[PDB]
Amino acid sequence: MNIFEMLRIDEGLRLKIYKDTEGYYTIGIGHLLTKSPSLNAAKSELDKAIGRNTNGVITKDEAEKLFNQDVDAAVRGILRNAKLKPVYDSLDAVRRAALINMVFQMGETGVAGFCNSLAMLQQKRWDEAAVNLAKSRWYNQTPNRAKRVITTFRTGTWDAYKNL
Numbered sequence: 001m002n003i004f005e006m007l008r009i010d011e012g013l014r015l016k017i018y019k020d021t022e023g024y025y026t027i028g029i030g031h032l033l034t035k036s037p038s039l040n041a042a043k044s045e046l047d048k049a050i051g052r053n054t055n056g057v058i059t060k061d062e063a064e065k066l067f068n069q070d071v072d073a074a075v076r077g078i079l080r081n082a083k084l085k086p087v088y089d090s091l092d093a094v095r096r097a098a099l100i101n102m103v104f105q106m107g108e109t110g111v112a113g114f115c116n117s118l119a120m121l122q123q124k125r126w127d128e129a130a131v132n133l134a135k136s137r138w139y140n141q142t143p144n145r146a147k148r149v150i151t152t153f154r155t156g157t158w159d160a161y162k163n164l
């Protein structure tokens with residue numbers, strides 16, 4: 001298991017524009033196109049992202065390309081963020097992947113707001129961190145996914161993602 005395989009399981013793969021759990025136009029492996037309710041706006045973002053006129057449809061290679069960019073961007077985002085970098089650096093590689101997964105899903109800003117949870121993680125109080133992480137809109141709206149990420153932070157293993 002690794003961050004790519006982990007997010008591939010959590011985000012799925014779809015080659016046509018679809019709406020994500022929040023109702024937002026998305027494509028590929030969880031590539032958010034826009035929060036605008038206009039399909040035309042989403043299509044424009046997609047053609048820009050891919051570099052051709054796609055009419056709302058891309059290939060698996062194209063999906064994987066955006067995905068690699070989105071993973072890289074999440075991580076570099078973490079490393080440029082004064083609230084996230086110290087926790088990230090303090091973690092082992094498995095729990096690092098959990099933190100990348102959160103940022104991919106909710107953005108740097110949403111995760112930075114988890115300051116109480118981040119402090120518990122910095123302190124390696126893994127069970128306490130897990131309890132605090134669940135007290136969140138994130139857990140309530142995507143509980144199965146949140147449970148997997150929280151298990152990863154609690155155990156520092158991939159147990160929630162193997163057999164899946």
Ligand SMILES: *SCC1=CC(C)(C)N(O)C1(C)C
Binds near residue numbers: 084114117
């Ligand atoms: S969200 C940034 C942050 C603030 C403080 C409460 C000092 N923390 O421990 C972290 C780094 C979580």
